Amino acid sequence: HSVVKKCCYDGACVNNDETCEQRAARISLGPRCIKAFTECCVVASQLRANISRLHMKTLLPVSKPEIRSYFPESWLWEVHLVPRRKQLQFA
């Protein structure tokens, strides 16, 4: 639950292309974290030659605000003086 717990995540992630130990060389933050990011990637890659299709990932802060769908500019946002009856038209 350390500020490091992230690295022991986005280090776990996939890399068909490149290997952990080199991957980590790229990481500006703390050697405090480099550790995490290394052991993690290392182990997920260990396991990546066994439960496979059919792995499956549990998560840490799975918390981002997203909405799949968009919503338009509303319209008919006007204010009117209405004399017992008034009627405006519009498409």
Side-chain angles (χ1 to χ4, degrees):
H1 96 264
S2 197
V3 178
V4 199
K5 78 193 206 50
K6 47 183 167 192
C7 310
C8 198
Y9 180 140
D10 21 10
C13 265
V14 181
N15 213 81
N16 259 280
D17 286 312
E18 297 313 310
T19 91
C20 343
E21 209 289 338
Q22 2 136 297
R23 231 156 87 190
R26 224 179 300 168
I27 311 168
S28 298
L29 49 55
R32 327 182 178 186
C33 160
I34 297 306
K35 251 272 191 175
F37 177 79
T38 318
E39 65 196 15
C40 264
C41 155
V42 162
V43 164
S45 270
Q46 296 311 281
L47 288 154
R48 260 163 192 178
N50 282 78
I51 203 61
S52 69
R53 209 158 68 138
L54 179 54
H55 310 270
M56 106 154 53
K57 67 186 178 83
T58 359
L59 302 201
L60 315 182
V62 58
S63 312
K64 41 191 178 57
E66 298 189 358
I67 47 89
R68 62 275 167 267
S69 51
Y70 175 91
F71 288 103
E73 168 95 334
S74 305
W75 46 288
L76 225 237
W77 185 254
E78 41 199 78
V79 233
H80 279 322
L81 158 24
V82 188
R84 260 308 246 257
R85 248 183 292 167
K86 176 222 203 149
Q87 172 191 92
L88 68 130
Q89 9 223 238
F90 64 143

Short mmCIF file of all heavy atoms in Angstrom, two decimals, residues 22-58:
data_model
loop_
_atom_site.label_atom_id
_atom_site.label_comp_id
_atom_site.label_asym_id
_atom_site.label_seq_id
_atom_site.Cartn_x
_atom_site.Cartn_y
_atom_site.Cartn_z
N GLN A 22 15.54 -4.37 -18.42
CA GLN A 22 15.87 -3.21 -19.25
C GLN A 22 14.78 -2.14 -19.20
O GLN A 22 15.06 -0.95 -19.12
CB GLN A 22 16.13 -3.63 -20.69
CG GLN A 22 15.94 -5.11 -20.92
CD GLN A 22 15.18 -5.36 -22.20
OE1 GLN A 22 14.02 -4.96 -22.34
NE2 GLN A 22 15.84 -6.01 -23.16
N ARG A 23 13.53 -2.59 -19.22
CA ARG A 23 12.37 -1.70 -19.12
C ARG A 23 12.58 -0.72 -17.99
O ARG A 23 12.45 0.49 -18.15
CB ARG A 23 11.09 -2.50 -18.85
CG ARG A 23 9.94 -2.19 -19.80
CD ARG A 23 8.98 -3.36 -19.88
NE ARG A 23 7.97 -3.30 -18.84
CZ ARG A 23 7.13 -4.29 -18.56
NH1 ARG A 23 7.18 -5.44 -19.24
NH2 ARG A 23 6.23 -4.15 -17.60
N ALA A 24 12.92 -1.26 -16.83
CA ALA A 24 13.01 -0.47 -15.62
C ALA A 24 14.09 0.62 -15.68
O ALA A 24 13.96 1.66 -15.03
CB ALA A 24 13.22 -1.37 -14.43
N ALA A 25 15.15 0.37 -16.44
CA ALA A 25 16.21 1.36 -16.57
C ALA A 25 15.67 2.75 -16.95
O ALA A 25 16.32 3.79 -16.72
CB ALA A 25 17.25 0.88 -17.59
N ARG A 26 14.46 2.76 -17.50
CA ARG A 26 13.82 3.96 -18.03
C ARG A 26 13.14 4.83 -16.96
O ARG A 26 12.64 5.91 -17.28
CB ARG A 26 12.75 3.52 -19.05
CG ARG A 26 12.69 4.30 -20.34
CD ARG A 26 11.60 3.72 -21.23
NE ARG A 26 11.85 2.32 -21.56
CZ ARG A 26 10.95 1.52 -22.13
NH1 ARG A 26 9.75 2.00 -22.41
NH2 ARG A 26 11.24 0.25 -22.40
N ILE A 27 13.12 4.35 -15.71
CA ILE A 27 12.21 4.89 -14.68
C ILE A 27 12.74 5.96 -13.73
O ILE A 27 13.49 5.65 -12.80
CB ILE A 27 11.66 3.80 -13.81
CG1 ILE A 27 11.12 2.69 -14.69
CG2 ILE A 27 10.58 4.36 -12.93
CD1 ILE A 27 10.80 1.43 -13.92
N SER A 28 12.29 7.20 -13.93
CA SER A 28 12.84 8.39 -13.27
C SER A 28 12.64 8.46 -11.76
O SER A 28 13.44 9.08 -11.05
CB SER A 28 12.26 9.66 -13.90
OG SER A 28 12.60 9.76 -15.28
N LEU A 29 11.59 7.83 -11.25
CA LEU A 29 11.30 7.94 -9.83
C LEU A 29 12.28 7.14 -8.95
O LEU A 29 13.40 6.84 -9.37
CB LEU A 29 9.83 7.63 -9.51
CG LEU A 29 9.13 6.38 -10.04
CD1 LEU A 29 9.92 5.15 -9.66
CD2 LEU A 29 7.72 6.28 -9.49
N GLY A 30 11.86 6.81 -7.73
CA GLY A 30 12.75 6.26 -6.73
C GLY A 30 13.20 4.81 -6.90
O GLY A 30 12.42 3.94 -7.30
N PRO A 31 14.47 4.55 -6.57
CA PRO A 31 14.92 3.16 -6.50
C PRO A 31 14.05 2.44 -5.48
O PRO A 31 13.99 1.21 -5.45
CB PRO A 31 16.37 3.29 -6.00
CG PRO A 31 16.43 4.62 -5.32
CD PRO A 31 15.49 5.50 -6.09
N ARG A 32 13.37 3.23 -4.66
CA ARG A 32 12.38 2.72 -3.72
C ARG A 32 11.36 1.94 -4.53
O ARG A 32 10.90 0.88 -4.13
CB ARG A 32 11.69 3.89 -3.02
CG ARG A 32 12.61 5.07 -2.80
CD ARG A 32 11.93 6.21 -2.07
NE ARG A 32 12.86 7.31 -1.83
CZ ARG A 32 12.59 8.40 -1.11
NH1 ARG A 32 11.39 8.54 -0.55
NH2 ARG A 32 13.51 9.35 -0.95
N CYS A 33 11.04 2.47 -5.70
CA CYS A 33 10.03 1.88 -6.55
C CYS A 33 10.61 0.89 -7.55
O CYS A 33 10.02 -0.18 -7.82
CB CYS A 33 9.28 3.00 -7.27
SG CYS A 33 8.42 2.48 -8.76
N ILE A 34 11.77 1.23 -8.12
CA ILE A 34 12.41 0.37 -9.11
C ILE A 34 12.34 -1.09 -8.69
O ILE A 34 12.14 -1.98 -9.51
CB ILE A 34 13.89 0.73 -9.33
CG1 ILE A 34 14.01 2.14 -9.89
CG2 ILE A 34 14.54 -0.27 -10.27
CD1 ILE A 34 13.19 2.37 -11.14
N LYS A 35 12.53 -1.32 -7.39
CA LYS A 35 12.45 -2.65 -6.80
C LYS A 35 11.14 -3.29 -7.18
O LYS A 35 11.10 -4.32 -7.88
CB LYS A 35 12.49 -2.52 -5.28
CG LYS A 35 13.77 -2.99 -4.61
CD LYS A 35 13.73 -4.48 -4.28
CE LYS A 35 14.90 -4.88 -3.37
NZ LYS A 35 14.84 -6.30 -2.93
N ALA A 36 10.08 -2.65 -6.71
CA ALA A 36 8.72 -3.11 -6.96
C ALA A 36 8.58 -3.42 -8.43
O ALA A 36 8.29 -4.55 -8.82
CB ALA A 36 7.73 -2.05 -6.57
N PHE A 37 8.82 -2.40 -9.25
CA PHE A 37 8.60 -2.57 -10.69
C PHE A 37 9.39 -3.75 -11.27
O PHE A 37 8.99 -4.32 -12.30
CB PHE A 37 8.94 -1.29 -11.46
CG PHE A 37 8.81 -1.43 -12.96
CD1 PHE A 37 7.57 -1.37 -13.57
CD2 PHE A 37 9.93 -1.59 -13.76
CE1 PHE A 37 7.45 -1.48 -14.93
CE2 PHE A 37 9.81 -1.69 -15.13
CZ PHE A 37 8.57 -1.65 -15.72
N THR A 38 10.50 -4.10 -10.63
CA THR A 38 11.32 -5.19 -11.14
C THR A 38 10.77 -6.54 -10.71
O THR A 38 10.48 -7.39 -11.57
CB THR A 38 12.81 -5.06 -10.74
OG1 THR A 38 13.24 -3.70 -10.87
CG2 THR A 38 13.68 -5.93 -11.65
N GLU A 39 10.61 -6.74 -9.41
CA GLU A 39 10.15 -8.05 -8.95
C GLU A 39 8.83 -8.41 -9.64
O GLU A 39 8.64 -9.54 -10.13
CB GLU A 39 10.03 -8.10 -7.42
CG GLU A 39 8.97 -7.19 -6.82
CD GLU A 39 9.14 -6.98 -5.32
OE1 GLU A 39 10.22 -7.31 -4.78
OE2 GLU A 39 8.19 -6.48 -4.69
N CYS A 40 7.95 -7.42 -9.72
CA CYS A 40 6.66 -7.59 -10.37
C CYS A 40 6.72 -8.09 -11.82
O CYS A 40 6.31 -9.22 -12.12
CB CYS A 40 5.88 -6.28 -10.32
SG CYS A 40 4.74 -6.20 -8.94
N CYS A 41 7.21 -7.24 -12.73
CA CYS A 41 7.42 -7.63 -14.11
C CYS A 41 8.05 -9.02 -14.17
O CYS A 41 7.59 -9.91 -14.90
CB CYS A 41 8.32 -6.64 -14.83
SG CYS A 41 9.21 -7.33 -16.28
N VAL A 42 9.12 -9.20 -13.39
CA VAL A 42 9.83 -10.47 -13.37
C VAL A 42 8.85 -11.64 -13.16
O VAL A 42 8.84 -12.59 -13.97
CB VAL A 42 10.95 -10.48 -12.30
CG1 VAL A 42 11.38 -11.90 -11.98
CG2 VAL A 42 12.13 -9.65 -12.78
N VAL A 43 8.02 -11.56 -12.12
CA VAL A 43 7.07 -12.63 -11.81
C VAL A 43 5.90 -12.81 -12.78
O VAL A 43 5.51 -13.94 -13.11
CB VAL A 43 6.54 -12.47 -10.40
CG1 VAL A 43 5.29 -13.32 -10.22
CG2 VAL A 43 7.63 -12.85 -9.41
N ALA A 44 5.32 -11.71 -13.24
CA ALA A 44 4.26 -11.81 -14.23
C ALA A 44 4.78 -12.46 -15.51
O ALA A 44 4.07 -13.25 -16.15
CB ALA A 44 3.65 -10.44 -14.52
N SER A 45 6.02 -12.15 -15.88
CA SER A 45 6.64 -12.82 -17.02
C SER A 45 6.96 -14.28 -16.73
O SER A 45 6.83 -15.13 -17.61
CB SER A 45 7.89 -12.08 -17.50
OG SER A 45 7.54 -11.12 -18.49
N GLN A 46 7.37 -14.57 -15.49
CA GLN A 46 7.51 -15.97 -15.07
C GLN A 46 6.24 -16.68 -15.46
O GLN A 46 6.23 -17.56 -16.32
CB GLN A 46 7.64 -16.09 -13.55
CG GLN A 46 8.88 -15.47 -12.97
CD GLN A 46 10.12 -15.88 -13.71
OE1 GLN A 46 10.64 -16.98 -13.49
NE2 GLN A 46 10.61 -15.01 -14.60
N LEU A 47 5.16 -16.27 -14.82
CA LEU A 47 3.87 -16.92 -15.02
C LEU A 47 3.34 -16.86 -16.46
O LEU A 47 2.48 -17.67 -16.84
CB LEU A 47 2.83 -16.34 -14.05
CG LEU A 47 2.89 -16.67 -12.55
CD1 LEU A 47 2.22 -15.56 -11.75
CD2 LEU A 47 2.26 -18.03 -12.20
N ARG A 48 3.84 -15.92 -17.25
CA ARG A 48 3.32 -15.73 -18.61
C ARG A 48 3.59 -16.90 -19.55
O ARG A 48 3.12 -16.90 -20.69
CB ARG A 48 3.86 -14.43 -19.21
CG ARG A 48 2.86 -13.30 -19.14
CD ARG A 48 3.53 -11.97 -19.34
NE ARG A 48 2.63 -10.90 -18.98
CZ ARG A 48 2.95 -9.62 -19.03
NH1 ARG A 48 4.16 -9.23 -19.42
NH2 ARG A 48 2.04 -8.72 -18.67
N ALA A 49 4.33 -17.89 -19.07
CA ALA A 49 4.55 -19.11 -19.82
C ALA A 49 3.84 -20.30 -19.17
O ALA A 49 4.35 -21.42 -19.20
CB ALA A 49 6.02 -19.40 -19.96
N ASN A 50 2.66 -20.06 -18.58
CA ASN A 50 1.87 -21.15 -18.00
C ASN A 50 0.33 -21.10 -18.17
O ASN A 50 -0.22 -21.93 -18.89
CB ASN A 50 2.30 -21.47 -16.56
CG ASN A 50 3.59 -22.31 -16.52
OD1 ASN A 50 4.69 -21.80 -16.69
ND2 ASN A 50 3.44 -23.61 -16.29
N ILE A 51 -0.38 -20.15 -17.55
CA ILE A 51 -1.85 -20.16 -17.72
C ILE A 51 -2.31 -19.85 -19.17
O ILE A 51 -3.51 -19.73 -19.46
CB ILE A 51 -2.58 -19.27 -16.66
CG1 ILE A 51 -4.06 -19.70 -16.47
CG2 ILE A 51 -2.43 -17.79 -17.01
CD1 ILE A 51 -4.28 -21.12 -15.99
N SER A 52 -1.36 -19.73 -20.09
CA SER A 52 -1.68 -19.64 -21.51
C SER A 52 -0.82 -20.58 -22.36
O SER A 52 0.31 -20.24 -22.75
CB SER A 52 -1.55 -18.19 -22.01
OG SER A 52 -0.20 -17.77 -22.03
N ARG A 53 -4.07 -17.66 -23.98
CA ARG A 53 -5.37 -17.22 -23.48
C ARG A 53 -5.57 -17.77 -22.06
O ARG A 53 -4.93 -18.75 -21.66
CB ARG A 53 -6.49 -17.65 -24.44
CG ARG A 53 -7.73 -16.73 -24.46
CD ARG A 53 -8.57 -16.84 -25.77
NE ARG A 53 -9.26 -18.13 -25.94
CZ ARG A 53 -10.51 -18.27 -26.38
NH1 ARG A 53 -11.23 -17.20 -26.70
NH2 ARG A 53 -11.05 -19.49 -26.50
N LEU A 54 -6.45 -17.11 -21.31
CA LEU A 54 -6.84 -17.49 -19.96
C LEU A 54 -5.85 -17.18 -18.82
O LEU A 54 -5.48 -18.07 -18.05
CB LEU A 54 -7.29 -18.96 -19.90
CG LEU A 54 -7.72 -19.49 -18.52
CD1 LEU A 54 -8.78 -18.61 -17.92
CD2 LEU A 54 -8.19 -20.94 -18.59
N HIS A 55 -5.43 -15.92 -18.69
CA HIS A 55 -4.74 -15.48 -17.48
C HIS A 55 -5.79 -14.97 -16.53
O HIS A 55 -6.60 -15.72 -16.00
CB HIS A 55 -3.76 -14.34 -17.75
CG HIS A 55 -2.82 -14.58 -18.89
ND1 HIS A 55 -1.59 -15.18 -18.73
CD2 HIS A 55 -2.92 -14.27 -20.20
CE1 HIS A 55 -0.98 -15.25 -19.89
NE2 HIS A 55 -1.76 -14.70 -20.81
N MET A 56 -5.76 -13.65 -16.34
CA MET A 56 -6.76 -12.90 -15.59
C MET A 56 -6.10 -12.01 -14.53
O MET A 56 -5.30 -12.48 -13.72
CB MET A 56 -7.82 -13.81 -14.97
CG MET A 56 -7.68 -13.98 -13.47
SD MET A 56 -9.24 -14.40 -12.63
CE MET A 56 -9.74 -15.81 -13.61
N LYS A 57 -6.46 -10.73 -14.54
CA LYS A 57 -5.80 -9.73 -13.69
C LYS A 57 -6.71 -9.05 -12.65
O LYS A 57 -7.73 -8.45 -12.98
CB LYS A 57 -5.10 -8.67 -14.56
CG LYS A 57 -6.03 -7.79 -15.36
CD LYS A 57 -5.26 -6.86 -16.32
CE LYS A 57 -6.17 -5.95 -17.21
NZ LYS A 57 -6.65 -4.68 -16.51
N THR A 58 -6.32 -9.17 -11.39
CA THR A 58 -6.88 -8.36 -10.31
C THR A 58 -6.07 -7.01 -10.25
O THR A 58 -4.90 -6.91 -10.71
CB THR A 58 -7.06 -9.14 -8.91
OG1 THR A 58 -6.65 -10.51 -9.01
CG2 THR A 58 -8.50 -9.16 -8.48
#
